[PDB]
């Protein structure tokens, strides 16, 4: 397993636009459009700018993994630039990295970066604690399912929610 695939099944493909689970423009796998509510051009707009060609709402696969590609990068390298995040993405091993970059795939750099007291407990290592503390949050009122899943990933260092 990686972090591919991982959130490759956190998200899933729609290659039509989407609505989020919070109502937003989306597609592909996991890619946000637009937070607005217009469609027929806001959304339309955005894909249409993001794929470099007059869409219509529809991509194709090849075209759903490319923005996959970009959005997987970006997370990571986001994650390096961060002050806040960098330390403990490098405190952490293998498994652990990648459910940080879930979080940040999903959340947004800033959105990670303020579960300051979950992201001190995961730098010192105390996993049942940072665990406890991660649940406590609109993410997992929201995404229940995918937040325990990325939270069985930090708590045991293993892809088990994910096999
Ligand atoms: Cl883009
Ligand atoms: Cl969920």
Redo the contacts with the bound molecule.
């Keep these: 397993m990686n972090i591919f695939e991982m959130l490759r099944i956190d998200e899933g493909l729609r290659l039509k636009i989407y609505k989020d689970?919070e109502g937003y423009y989306t597609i592909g796998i996991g890619h946000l459009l637009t937070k607005s509510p217009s469609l027929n051009a806001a959304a339309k707009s955005e894909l249409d700018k993001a794929i470099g060609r007059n869409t219509n709402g529809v991509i194709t696969k090849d075209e759903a993994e490319k923005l996959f590609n970009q959005d997987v990068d970006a997370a990571v390298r986001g994650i390096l630039r961060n002050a806040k995040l960098k330390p403990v993405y490098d405190s952490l091993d293998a498994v652990r990295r990648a459910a940080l970059i879930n979080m940040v795939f999903q959340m947004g750099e800033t959105g990670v970066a303020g579960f300051t007291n979950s992201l001190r407990m995961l730098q010192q290592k105390r996993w049942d604690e940072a665990a406890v503390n991660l649940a406590k949050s609109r993410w997992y009122n929201?995404?229940?399912?995918?937040?325990?899943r990325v939270i069985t990933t930090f708590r045991t260092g293993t892809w088990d929610a994910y096999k």
């Design positions: 689970t929201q995404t229940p399912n995918r937040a325990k």
